Every structure is written in structure tokens, then in C-alpha cells.
């Protein structure tokens, strides 16, 4: 059997589908990993990763028979693509098939923060409705929605938001032709012109902390940050502090700079919503993603064109 | 000054705007109400109500100089329209200007229930992310959305849902022409053909408990009820029981049969979201609603056509 190393427990269904076609190895269940590696290097010809654990230089080097990294994710920042090319390794990912769900999440977060849906449900559950009305909140429809990275997921968000009458603005390195959204040439100018700012760009050293104190200052005390990209896209300590002090209106967060660690100071804030990276986390979508990873592995090991190759 | 009786504390801004133009009376702050009534009947020429307290037969009769009931709401089920006509009383309401916000709430509820946004945020806040992943949830995009009452708010919901690729179905007493949504001639058939069922019709004796056990049975264990209409539209005890037992997939509720009382058995359910009637509860919308009530009062007392008359 071909040895396939799965980096972490990302999908029981994927475990099943991999185990019936290959020799599935469960990296996360080995106490002494380096030795394990050394011990099964001769067998491991594929790596299956995701947004928590991919294939870095050091792993790739310990896996000298590695032929392909098939990521259970669209994001690729956990995979060393350069190293991959130097050692002959293909790389595939899962684009588009999760688009719908991550953009639905971004809209869910907007509403949950502006309409305090989470705070309302808690208010009710502790019997506080008996003593009075919940406070007034903020209207979503018609608000200015700015999107950083008008890509597959950014476009999907934009089109949902349009149906709520939101004026759409965006920053990308380049303007998407034939779109009537407002292009801005800098994240800071975008944030000044947005009630709501959505992060939908990939993570690279060039977009690391693209949400900084300046941007946060530009967004302001009435402004709301939606992060469905990657944790390190934001200078988390400056995000936490602007929220604690009231210098940023609020935030809906699916990803954190050091997940699953979430700064506990956020835990007492009522102008934030915090989710454990669930953008793609539905039965329907994880299924298709899993079949896609399988598909790429089965294409690779049978000499066919890969399905969603990146490298 | 013209005596205006405000039934309950619905809007500080409205209190302000009323108090600067009329003699504002605060019904809710009188211990012995019947006597109060008797005592200020000669002065009270207007009633301002809302969805919690309107103007019933008995109140109208105790207010023999009553000329107009201006409701701080679109719903009119708290106003006795027949009695109003017999005693010469105008009635106005606030249609359209809250449409956006109540339909945004319905979408917010759908997402918050299908994507367990509220359960996710709680999971995070109690440190559970450190021990593992939140469970998989349900995709909203593409699901069958059924709407009971394709009116101002029902249409607004339908058009939002379309942008998530949802097939739209509806039941109204009559089919809206030129719409390509699927008309069904009965709520039960609608529920059988819906993943998500939204209540957006007015409350009358004819729609009371329109959501019954049969409908609930039709919706089923994977089906999700969204109630943004009125509490008594549902047979609450049968709703509670289907949720406790798992016979209904889940529910997002803005209104309850006996608000603000909410059946505490709901408090332990993770497949429900509970909000204290906040459909219209934003600074932006309550402002416009308040100016509308004022507008109708100022039109009435100055012999002009009313703005949003119903009676
Ligand atoms: N929450 C979650 O579960 C979750 C799930 C999936 C994905 N994600 C994140 O979402 C990202 C986006 O996915 P996608 O599928 O939509 O990919 P995508 O189609 O590649 O879109 C990415 C976009 O970002 C823009 N971009 C790239 N580099 C940029 C830069 N330096 N500055 C500004 N904009 C830049 C691109 O525009 P230009 O080329 O013009 O600049 C493009 O619009 C992933 O990489 C991942 O990190 C999160
Ligand atoms: N959550 C909250 O804060 C909140 C806020 C505002 C309003 N509401 C509720 O929302 C309701 C709807 O408001 P709206 O502004 O959208 O009013 P609307 O425009 O009158 O729309 C009502 C709709 O319900 C349908 N309908 C009326 N009677 C019906 C019946 N017996 N059976 C089935 N359908 C019936 C109508 O269609 P047909 O005539 O063809 O049957 C119409 O589509 C209000 O009356 C109120 O109770 C709740």
C-alpha cells in the first residue's frame, strides 16, 4: 500500500476514505514524531495536510520519498511550496468547493455582531428579558462593506452583501474588471471608507499583519472587523486592545494569530463574536473537500493530470 | 396640550419627541391604571402603542375622547380595529421602514442556527477549543427556504436568501404574480418542501397556531423553523417538545407566545437561538419609526391626510 501521512485529525470521513485506498499514517498519534518519521520515511509517499498542519521544509526533508502534498484546505501557507518544488513534490488544494460556506460565515458574523445575536440569546437564557428590553443595535442593510481580497470568497461575500443593499468597496493588488464595486489602492483608505471590513486574502509575509493599528485606527470606534482569512493577518495584540478600550466598534473572528489560543481578554467583550475556525465546517462541504483530496491523490498515483494542482 | 397616552416604555427618543409637542402620559408608570384612566380621560386624545400594548375594546371604552391610535409597529393585533371604527378612532402603523432590519434578523437567525454561531462562541469562551474542534454544522447556501406570508418582510427575506442560492418557496392566500418562487396552497405542503421555514404573516385568529404539530411533523428532525412574526403563530408547547425530543431540527425565535416569558426548557437546547423580540431593534430604524408615529399624530391633529393609516 502507498503510505499516506495525515498530519492531524481533520476528517473522520477523510480518514475512512484514505484508509481504504492507501496505508494511512496518523502523524498526530505518534509521541516521538522525528523517530516515527525516520522510521516510516521509506513508505510515506503522500502528505495530507490542512490549515493547522501542512508540510514545512523540515518535514519535507524528513520525508525523502515524498511525491505529493494534498491539502485539505484552499490556503497553502502551511505548505513550503519552494521546498516542494526543489524536492519534486506536487501540491494540490481545495479551492471553490468551500467558497459558499466561508462567505455565509462572514455574513453570519456580520449579523451576529451588528445585531448582537449572541448577546441577545444569552440575555434571554439568563432570564433578563423579564426585567426589560435588550438594547438597540446596528442596522446591517445599506452599510458600507469593504473587502480585502476580492477573490473567490471575497466575491462571494460581496454578492451576498449586495442583496442587503450594501455599497461594496474593495482592495486588491489589481482591480477586477467589469465590477462596479469601489476599488481602493490601499487597505488604509479602504478601512476609512467602510463600516464593515472583511479579510479575504491569502496569508503571505506580504499580508501578515495587513490589519495593523493604522488600519484599526482607520476603521474606528464604530467600525467592524470581520476576519475569515488567517489569524496572522491581524496584529492580534493591537486588535485585542482596540476592542478592550472601545477604539474599534466590534469584531467577528473565525481565526486567531495562535489558534486555538484565543486571548482571554476577548472573552468578556460583548462587541465581538469568536468562532473556532469553522468557515468550511459543514457536513456537506467537508465531504466534497475530502473527495477532492482523494481525487487528487488518486490522480497522482495513477499518472493522470491532477485535479487542483498548485505546484 | 393634547394628551397622548404612551402604553409602555418603547422609545426614549419617542418619549422625547412626543413630550415636546403634546402632553405625554406614561401609562406604564401608574399603579392604579383604571382610576388613572378615569382621571385623565378628558385629556387623552391619542394613544401610542406597540406590539406589547395597543388599544383593546376596554381601553378604548375607558378613553371616550380617543381620536387616534398611532402604533409604534407594523403589526396591529394589539389594536381592536372594529372597536376603533365604532368609536370613530383613526389607526396608523409603521409599515416598510422596519422591513430591512426584520428580514436581516431572519437571515441572521438562519445562519446563527445552521452554523451554530452562538454555540461556537460559547465553546470558544469556555476554553474548549484547546481540547479539540467544534462539531460540523449545516450548509445554508442552496437550501430550500419556505416562507409563510410573502409580504413586505417575507419578500425581503426571499430576496436575501436568493443571493445564497436558495430555492424559494412560499404560501400566501394568493400567489404573487410575476414571481418565480414556488407557490404552495398549504402551510403543511410548504413545510414538507422546506429545509427552512420562515413565519412572516400577520397575527389574526386565522393564523393563530398556524405552526402546529402537523406542520412541525412536516418540517421534521432536519427542518428549521424561523419565527419572526408573532409568538401565538406557533403552538409553543408543541414547538418546545419537538425541540426537546429532537423531532424538529432547530429553531431561531424572535417572538414567543407569552413574551417576555420564554419556556425555560428551551434554555438548555443547543439547536435553538432565542432573541427578545428585536426584529426592528436598531438605532437607525427605531428613529424613523418614531418620526413616523409623530408624523401621523401631527397630521391627524392638524386636519391633514394621515401618513400610514389603517383605520
Ligand atoms: N475561515 C476559514 O475557514 C477559511 C477557509 C478557506 C479559506 N480561508 C482563507 O481565505 C483565503 C482566500 O481564499 P480564496 O479561495 O478566496 O482565494 P483567492 O481566490 O485566491 O482569493 C484571494 C484574493 O486575495 C487577493 N490578494 C492576494 N494577495 C494579496 C495581497 N498581497 N494583498 C491584497 N490582496 C491580495 C487577491 O487579489 P489580487 O491578486 O489582485 O491582489 C484575491 O482577490 C485563503 O487563502 C485562506 O487563507 C479561510
Ligand atoms: N420580529 C419583529 O420584530 C416583527 C417586526 C415587524 C413585524 N413583525 C410581524 O410581521 C408581520 C408581517 O409584516 P409585513 O410588514 O411584512 O406585513 P405584510 O406586508 O402585510 O405581509 C404579510 C403577508 O402575510 C400574508 N398573509 C396574510 N394573511 C394570511 C393568512 N391568513 N395566511 C397566510 N398568509 C397570510 C399575506 O399574503 P396573502 O394576503 O396572500 O395571504 C402577506 O404576504 C406583522 O404583521 C408582524 O406580526 C414582526
Amino acid at each position: 500500500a502507498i503510505g499516506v501521512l495525515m498530519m492531524c485529525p481533520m476528517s473522520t470521513y477523510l480518514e475512512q476514505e484514505l484508509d481504504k485506498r492507501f496505508k494511512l499514517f496518523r502523524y498526530w498519534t505518534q509521541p516521538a514524531q522525528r523517530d516515527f518519521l525516520a522510521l516510516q520515511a521509506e513508505s510515506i509517499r503522500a502528505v495530507v495536510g490542512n490549515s493547522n498542519a501542512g508540510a514545512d521544509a523540515e518535514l519535507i526533508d524528513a520525508l525523502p520519498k515524498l511525491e505529493i502534498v494534498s491539502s485539505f484546505s484552499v490556503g497553502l501557507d502551511k505548505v513550503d511550496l519552494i521546498k516542494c518544488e526543489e524536492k519534486g513534490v506536487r501540491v494540490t488544494n481545495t479551492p471553490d468547493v468551500l467558497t459558499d460556506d466561508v462567505a455565509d460565515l462572514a455574513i453570519g458574523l456580520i449579523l451576529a455582531v451588528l445585531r448582537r445575536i449572541c448577546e441577545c440569546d444569552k440575555y434571554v437564557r439568563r432570564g433578563a428579558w423579564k426585567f426589560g428590553d435588550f438594547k438597540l443595535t446596528t442596522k446591517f442593510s445599506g452599510k458600507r462593506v469593504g473587502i480585502i481580497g476580492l477573490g473567490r470568497i471575497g466575491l462571494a461575500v460581496a454578492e451576498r452583501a449586495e442583496a442587503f443593499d450594501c455599497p461594496i468597496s474593495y482592495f486588491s493588488r489589481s482591480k477586477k474588471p467589469n465590477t462596479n464595486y469601489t476599488y481602493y489602492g490601499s487597505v488604509v483608505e479602504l478601512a476609512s471608507n467602510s463600516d464593515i471590513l472583511v479579510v479575504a486574502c491569502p496569508l503571505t509575509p506580504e499580508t501578515t499583519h495587513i490589519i495593523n493599528r493604522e488600519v484599526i485606527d482607520a476603521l474606528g470606534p464604530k467600525g467592524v472587523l470581520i476576519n475569515i482569512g488567517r489569524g496572522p493577518h491581524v496584529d492580534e495584540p493591537e486588535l485585542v486592545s482596540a476592542l478592550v478600550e472601545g477604539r474599534l466598534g466590534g469584531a467577528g473572528l473565525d481565526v486567531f494569530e495562535r489558534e486555538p489560543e484565543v486571548p482571554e481578554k476577548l472573552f468578556g467583550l460583548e462587541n465581538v463574536v469568536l468562532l473556532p475556525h469553522v468557515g468550511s465546517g459543514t457536513v456537506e462541504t467537508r465531504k466534497v473537500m475530502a473527495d477532492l483530496v482523494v481525487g487528487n491523490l488518486e490522480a497522482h498515483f495513477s499518472g493522470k493530470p491532477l485535479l487542483t494542482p498548485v505546484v
Side-chain angles (χ1 to χ4, degrees), chain A residues 114-126:
Chain A
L114 263 71
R115 303 298 293 276
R116 293 299 202 271
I117 293 175
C118 293
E119 302 303 303
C120 277
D121 176 284
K122 277 170 233 188
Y123 180 92
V124 169
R125 297 194 196 234
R126 49 162 202 279

Side-chain angles (χ1 to χ4, degrees), chain A residues 50-56 69 71 73 75-80 203 230:
Chain A
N50 74 338
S51 59
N52 155 56
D56 63 6
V69 180
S71 207
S73 71
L76 286 164
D77 56 284
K78 290 305 194 165
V79 183
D80 193 318
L203 177 78
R230 285 289 181 269

Side-chain angles (χ1 to χ4, degrees), chain A residues 53-65:
Chain A
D56 63 6
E58 302 82 47
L59 185 94
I60 297 155
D61 258 347
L63 251 23
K65 308 294 174 140

Side-chain angles (χ1 to χ4, degrees), chain A residues 94 98 119 246 311:
Chain A
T94 70
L98 34 72
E119 302 303 303
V311 176

